[PDB]
Amino acid sequence: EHQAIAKMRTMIEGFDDISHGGLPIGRSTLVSGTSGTGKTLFSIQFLYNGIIEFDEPGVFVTFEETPQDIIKNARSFGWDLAKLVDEGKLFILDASPDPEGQEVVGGFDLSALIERINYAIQKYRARRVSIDSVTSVFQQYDASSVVRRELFRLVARLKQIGATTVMTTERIEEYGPIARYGVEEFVSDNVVILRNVLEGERRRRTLEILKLRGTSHMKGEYPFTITDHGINIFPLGAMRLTQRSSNVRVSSGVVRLDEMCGGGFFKDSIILATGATGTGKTLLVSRFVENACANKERAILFAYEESRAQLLRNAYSWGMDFEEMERQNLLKIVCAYPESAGLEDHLQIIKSEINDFKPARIAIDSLSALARGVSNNAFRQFVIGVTGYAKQEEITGLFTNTSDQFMGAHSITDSHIEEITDTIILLQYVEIRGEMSRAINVFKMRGSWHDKAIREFMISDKGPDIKDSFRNFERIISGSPTRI
Amino acid sequence: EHQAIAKMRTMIEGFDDISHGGLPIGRSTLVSGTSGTGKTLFSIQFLYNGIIEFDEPGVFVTFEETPQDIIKNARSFGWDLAKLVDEGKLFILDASPDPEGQEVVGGFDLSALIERINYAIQKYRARRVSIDSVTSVFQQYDASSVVRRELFRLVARLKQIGATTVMTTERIEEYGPIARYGVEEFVSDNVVILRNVLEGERRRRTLEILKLRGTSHMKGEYPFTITDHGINIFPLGAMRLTQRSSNVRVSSGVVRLDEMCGGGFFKDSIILATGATGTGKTLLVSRFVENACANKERAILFAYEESRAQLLRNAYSWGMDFEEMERQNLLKIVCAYPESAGLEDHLQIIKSEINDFKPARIAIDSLSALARGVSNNAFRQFVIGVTGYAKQEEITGLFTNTSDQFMGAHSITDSHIEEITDTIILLQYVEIRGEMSRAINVFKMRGSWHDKAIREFMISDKGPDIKDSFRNFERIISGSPTRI
Amino acid sequence: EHQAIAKMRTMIEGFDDISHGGLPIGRSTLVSGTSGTGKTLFSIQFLYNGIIEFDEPGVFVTFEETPQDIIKNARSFGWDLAKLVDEGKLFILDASPDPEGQEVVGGFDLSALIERINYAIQKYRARRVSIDSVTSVFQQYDASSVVRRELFRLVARLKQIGATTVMTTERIEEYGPIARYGVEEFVSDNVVILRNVLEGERRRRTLEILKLRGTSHMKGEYPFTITDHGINIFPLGAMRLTQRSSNVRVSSGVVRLDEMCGGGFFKDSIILATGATGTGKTLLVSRFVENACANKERAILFAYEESRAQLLRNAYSWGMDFEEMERQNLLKIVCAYPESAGLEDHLQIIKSEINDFKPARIAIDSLSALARGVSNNAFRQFVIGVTGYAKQEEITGLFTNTSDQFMGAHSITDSHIEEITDTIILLQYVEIRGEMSRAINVFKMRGSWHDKAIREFMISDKGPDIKDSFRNFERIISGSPTRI
Numbered sequence A, B, C: 001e002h003q004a005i006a007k008m009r010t011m012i013e014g015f016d017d018i019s020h021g022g023l024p025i026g027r028s029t030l031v032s033g034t035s036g037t038g039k040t041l042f043s044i045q046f047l048y049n050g051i052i053e054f055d056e057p058g059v060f061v062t063f064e065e066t067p068q069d070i071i072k073n074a075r076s077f078g079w080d081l082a083k084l085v086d087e088g089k090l091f092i093l094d095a096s097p098d099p100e101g102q103e104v105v106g107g108f109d110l111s112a113l114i115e116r117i118n119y120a121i122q123k124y125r126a127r128r129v130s131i132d133s134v135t136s137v138f139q140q141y142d143a144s145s146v147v148r149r150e151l152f153r154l155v156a157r158l159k160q161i162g163a164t165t166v167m168t169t170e171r172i173e174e175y176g177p178i179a180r181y182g183v184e185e186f187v188s189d190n191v192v193i194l195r196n197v198l199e200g201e202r203r204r205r206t207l208e209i210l211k212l213r214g215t216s217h218m219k220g221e222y223p224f225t226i227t228d229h230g231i232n233i234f235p236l237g238a239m240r241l242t243q244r245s246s247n248v249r250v251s252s253g254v255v256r257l258d259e260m261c262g263g264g265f266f267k268d269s270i271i272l273a274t275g276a277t278g279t280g281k282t283l284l285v286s287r288f289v290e291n292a293c294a295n296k297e298r299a300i301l302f303a304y305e306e307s308r309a310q311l312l313r314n315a316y317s318w319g320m321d322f323e324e325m326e327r328q329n330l331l332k333i334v335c336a337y338p339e340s341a342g343l344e345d346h347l348q349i350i351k352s353e354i355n356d357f358k359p360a361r362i363a364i365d366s367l368s369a370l371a372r373g374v375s376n377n378a379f380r381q382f383v384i385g386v387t388g389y390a391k392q393e394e395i396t397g398l399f400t401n402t403s404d405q406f407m408g409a410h411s412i413t414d415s416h417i418e419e420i421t422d423t424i425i426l427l428q429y430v431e432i433r434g435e436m437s438r439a440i441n442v443f444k445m446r447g448s449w450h451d452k453a454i455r456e457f458m459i460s461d462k463g464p465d466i467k468d469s470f471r472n473f474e475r476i477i478s479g480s481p482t483r484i
């Protein structure tokens, strides 16, 4: 209701939305995690993005890594730090110990380490101080309830100087105490916790802001992924899209399905195709993708069960010839497996492919095939992220979800994601005269009349040939027609 | 049965109902919690609300935060503390250690700290002493079973002075021991525990009063929220409402549904609409909201599965034109997501919107969409709180709950919240001649005759056109009619 | 098989049945618990009830609380201890330490504490010694396996003097070791453990006697409640009732239901009404309660999902006018919530209301509404307690249990409490011609013929008008009749 504290931007994607603007100006920030979770990378990215964008110099204090190894590690990410060192914009301070030395004094070097930082700030005019692996000096020969005074005097001095500070501390566990001694949380005004929790022989990185004194933030754990461009925090917000399309509709690919949907799906929506296995869902996906060749539009395909060669053979058995659209740069196939990578990296891969190719239609084959190992909440998060990222860029997406109970059941989606989609097409098996025929049904719509009827369809050598109706039977969806 | 001890009001909303009047007068109170849970904010709010309301001065003792940082943090909440310091109403005593000093004596400073506090009490005529972060002096260089005497002499001399005291202690765990040494619970006469427990990658703040010597309170854990106005504890009590409305009823929006319900729902009730997905629940919500434009009444809409445009386009496809009601200040759309914030914060958001807009009808779309990740007890608490806040302010509320098992099932609500609502409307699918039609049914009412029949309806380009009946069929609810 | 040891009564209500007569005479008793569970209150009540009833003087030993604070705390319960101190019947000895003193000797003061107790016993002729917070002297500066000798010499000396002793020890956990050092259990001949275990954000107090050397007791945990009159333990025993009523019956309220049950329920029984929601259970409860106005009898009503004014509005919509019975002191309404207090306290509230009002009929609306959060064993204990306490005072009780599966189901009660009740009335939904009609059925009886038939009824503007039968249908209970 009144004025708030000032805070400066770290320019990391996703993090500036979690903390409502960035780290506070003047205070410190504790970034604590297990080994191999991204504590050092956070500090280096926080320095580099501030140097490049706002021309704000910063220093980097080291305690167990030599500067040239840090530059060598950072070179693989793309950014060059030696050039910025030569330009006088970045200064890696070296406090790593000589392997040959003396140990006559335990930890009474902080009073000189402060001055070693302070003069360097006064010659480089730095703004972002970033002490890394600070838990190697104040705890080298000290026990508990002694490091409290050292951390207090350090944070108080960096507040007296008036620069943004980021610290780094190690952990022993994943869900236990936040730091090694359980006392560093009550000193730093900002606590950020990185986790690398392992469940079901799969790793998953998460970020959490525990406490921000004086301001507000997001409470809970938010996943991230260490890609080739650094930390990529995935946010949760879809207030950007303020547009809809009641105007001209894109074609489905089957003229009968367009007639049954009223003239096209929509320009942007989420189409869900469901049913049992062997019913014809991949045919619907292939007809949805191949239609982009008619209007010279770009559409790509995600495969999670098949593999390229088999997809081309099945397409040529239907008369599709995907090599022509592949050669015309109107088609791309990813052809990955659900267990090759974790579920969180699949969203980043899809986002990267969508950004690079810039397509108009996305078809994710077998959305339930990558929903087996993971729990319900992670799959719901993945589905919500995919649907939001497709909806905010006016892309017509079609998904596919096979069911376990093959003959007449209920609960159309076992993962309960039918409420996010816009259109639902119901495929099923209909036992007619002991020959196991199949039928189609437009279950629901979000803006047109959608032809409330049940249509028998077959699979010919060209495509889906939809027949008239089941008008002289009873209880069709239960897999047991009784003619009357 | 006899006279009780006196107690004074902290003027924090929610807390004065839990403790039956406030903290006791003369004794102390221990507020222990994990880092980042609201221990300091409780003390500052307890001082400020007592200064503003009853003109009672108070002191604030600090041990690890400088006074100007505390004033800067408190400025973001709206209240100014520097002005009250200049007015002589508040005194922040400073006992934080100088970073450059001496450590010849561990913690033998309480005999001077009592005099330092008492001299300020005698010069400011304070009533509310509030020692914060007390677990940094008596335990700075002391082991277990030694801090017992220090806390005992602290509480004894603060009771000899005779003022209300609030203490602050840290924790290491969430469900383990109450304090850091497991001994401070047996000294303080009042123990309040703050928790920040994490489950399902979501945080949830709770408050609990463990023991009040001499009086009664509420036993258990009660949730709270740190909003922009401080700690806002949600209580549990609905004895305020002593009014009912057997008189004039508000219209539903559909004249056929009003005829089927007997002339309107009621002035105040809880309407529940249920069924499977794609059945027409959002149409019922839209017709319930749009009817407020006829009588120049204010009504708002909560959306948890759509987003503005998706709602405006669907409304214009039915002939509603929500932009006119938005411009005439008779409609507001929230358009949030269930996973954006936790379930605990949604109740506060709804309460704030209801208080600010002052509407007459509330429509919460998809009450089951925010009941997925959370457990049953939390969702029941949320539903009970929403219904109580709607009922105590004579507001006609309509909710929406989709079911998982889409065809013929039982157990109308999977979360078993059917005993809180007042009206239940049953929407379902009816497989007729293999065209999959839909039907309506007023399942129950709480004061009218409500037309016990099953009516087929369709969705036209204007609204719901309800047809006559299913009089020549059988077992309609089971999703498989057999005509006779 | 032979003579047993003598034991004297503590006159605590509930405790004298668990321990088969009270604490043994001459020995000691250890009462150990967590902070805030009722250890001190047990000692004070044990002294007070022995002073008032048998005129037996007793002493109270303090180690961390001053006597005037103890008197101030005990004054809130109703009893005054200052007058008893002035009468020379009670002596609170003060051994609390001066905040200003010396610590040259750790804990070698027990040899003087023995004489200080012994002189007081010889000056007041006391019988009940009660040492409170004894775990502050022998463990103040002592380690493990050292307090064994101190506790041994203390218990041996109090046995040599020959007086009943009650001790108090603290805990750290809830289900771990019994005492702080795990050694005090093997010294005291009697061990009583108090627990304050927390589950589902709800507290629940239990009492357990671990060991009584030489005699017998009850094994397990027994719940208790700290009310305004002290500790009030609920026991488990129903050997008091030796009466039954095959004679004159009380009316149900509906003359058709009395004819269908054979002329009235009984003078004392347990009536259960079940079915789905919206079926007419509250109407049956209201007709059962309102009938007491005809014979000038007193009956009360418990509501757990209504709101007083709503009950009056629904009653006036049926033609009942509860305000006349409220003004004539023949009606009382509680109007509470199931989540306002725990299930443990609801039995105490019902017992207090029954004792104060002295009614003839009890009607607890929605017995399943307060059976959601709790487990099955706690709800079974609550039902058994309510039914036993209603049966032992010849009170005709009627209950209400809604089912989750609304359509044709089985297992009439999901909590399996159908075997406790005496009569069961089956309410259900019967789909007739697609209009969803309702029907009644007296499922079982315990002493009359009860008219084995299924009767359709409706709800008119006056009351339940029961129609003839379903004699031309089949499979009525399964919710889908087929006429033949």
Ligand SMILES: Nc1ncnc2c1ncn2[C@@H]1O[C@H](COP(=O)(O)OP(=O)(O)OP(=O)(O)O)[C@@H](O)[C@H]1O
Residues within 6 Å of the ligand: A034, A035, A036, A037, A038, A039, A040, A041, A042, A076, A077, A133, A226, A227, A228
């Ligand atoms: N080019 C890269 N692409 C993808 N992941 C990378 C790349 N370079 C490094 N990583 C990953 O980043 C992590 C390295 O993090 P970083 O070295 O910055 O800190 P840390 O290992 O968590 O800290 P500490 O040095 O204290 O153990 C590892 O998980 C590593 O696999």
Ligand SMILES: Nc1ncnc2c1ncn2[C@@H]1O[C@H](COP(=O)(O)OP(=O)(O)OP(=O)(O)O)[C@@H](O)[C@H]1O
Residues within 6 Å of the ligand: A276, A277, A278, A279, A280, A281, A282, A283, A284, A305, A314, A317, A318, A366, A402, A459, A460, A461
């Ligand atoms: N040339 C063909 N002639 C006849 N039927 C064919 C031909 N090619 C494929 N089919 C039919 O296609 C079906 C195989 O399933 P399809 O590849 O269409 O995928 P889907 O069932 O939609 O899903 P998924 O691939 O995930 O199982 C079978 O019913 C098979 O008979």
Ligand SMILES: Nc1ncnc2c1ncn2[C@@H]1O[C@H](COP(=O)(O)OP(=O)(O)OP(=O)(O)O)[C@@H](O)[C@H]1O
Residues within 6 Å of the ligand: A185, A186, A210, A211, A212, A213, A214, A215, A216, A217, B034, B035, B036, B037, B038, B039, B040, B041, B042, B076, B077, B133, B226, B227, B228
């Ligand atoms: N304006 C605000 N709006 C919302 N939440 C806020 C605001 N200001 C602070 N908070 C929250 O309040 C908490 C800060 O609590 P406070 O600093 O009073 O004590 P604490 O952090 O629990 O104690 P300690 O300093 O001992 O760790 C954090 O969770 C922070 O996110």
Ligand SMILES: Nc1ncnc2c1ncn2[C@@H]1O[C@H](COP(=O)(O)OP(=O)(O)OP(=O)(O)O)[C@@H](O)[C@H]1O
Residues within 6 Å of the ligand: A444, A445, A446, A447, A448, A449, A450, B276, B277, B278, B279, B280, B281, B282, B283, B284, B305, B314, B317, B318, B366, B402, B459, B460, B461
């Ligand atoms: N212009 C239209 N013409 C015909 N039918 C329409 C039109 N707009 C919407 N519908 C129908 O509305 C239904 C979509 O559901 P609706 O938006 O009414 O919400 P709901 O089923 O009550 O709930 P939810 O949005 O949670 O799924 C479909 O049956 C669809 O055919």
Ligand SMILES: Nc1ncnc2c1ncn2[C@@H]1O[C@H](COP(=O)(O)OP(=O)(O)OP(=O)(O)O)[C@@H](O)[C@H]1O
Residues within 6 Å of the ligand: B185, B186, B210, B211, B212, B213, B214, B215, B216, B217, C034, C035, C036, C037, C038, C039, C040, C041, C042, C076, C077, C133, C226, C227, C228
């Ligand atoms: N008048 C009262 N009505 C209801 N409950 C009360 C009343 N007075 C006290 N209590 C409750 O009784 C308990 C106090 O117990 P008591 O002070 O006798 O011992 P204790 O707190 O368990 O022991 P210790 O002081 O060693 O921690 C608390 O739970 C308090 O809420």
Ligand SMILES: Nc1ncnc2c1ncn2[C@@H]1O[C@H](COP(=O)(O)OP(=O)(O)OP(=O)(O)O)[C@@H](O)[C@H]1O
Residues within 6 Å of the ligand: B419, B444, B445, B446, B447, B448, B449, B450, C276, C277, C278, C279, C280, C281, C282, C283, C284, C314, C317, C318, C366, C402, C459, C460, C461
């Ligand atoms: N004035 C009235 N006219 C017609 N029917 C009424 C009237 N008042 C109530 N009803 C009927 O009463 C039923 C509502 O349930 P009722 O209040 O009788 O409680 P219940 O079903 O026994 O249980 P509960 O209240 O626990 O759900 C509906 O069937 C409704 O039609």
Ligand SMILES: [Mg+2]
Residues within 6 Å of the ligand: A039, A040, A133
């Ligand atoms: Mg590192």
Ligand SMILES: [Mg+2]
Residues within 6 Å of the ligand: A281, A282, A305, A365, A366
């Ligand atoms: Mg496939």
Ligand SMILES: [Mg+2]
Residues within 6 Å of the ligand: B039, B040, B133
């Ligand atoms: Mg604090």
Ligand SMILES: [Mg+2]
Residues within 6 Å of the ligand: B281, B282, B305, B365, B366
């Ligand atoms: Mg909807």
Ligand SMILES: [Mg+2]
Residues within 6 Å of the ligand: C039, C040, C133
């Ligand atoms: Mg006590």
Ligand SMILES: [Mg+2]
Residues within 6 Å of the ligand: C281, C282, C305, C365, C366
């Ligand atoms: Mg009822």
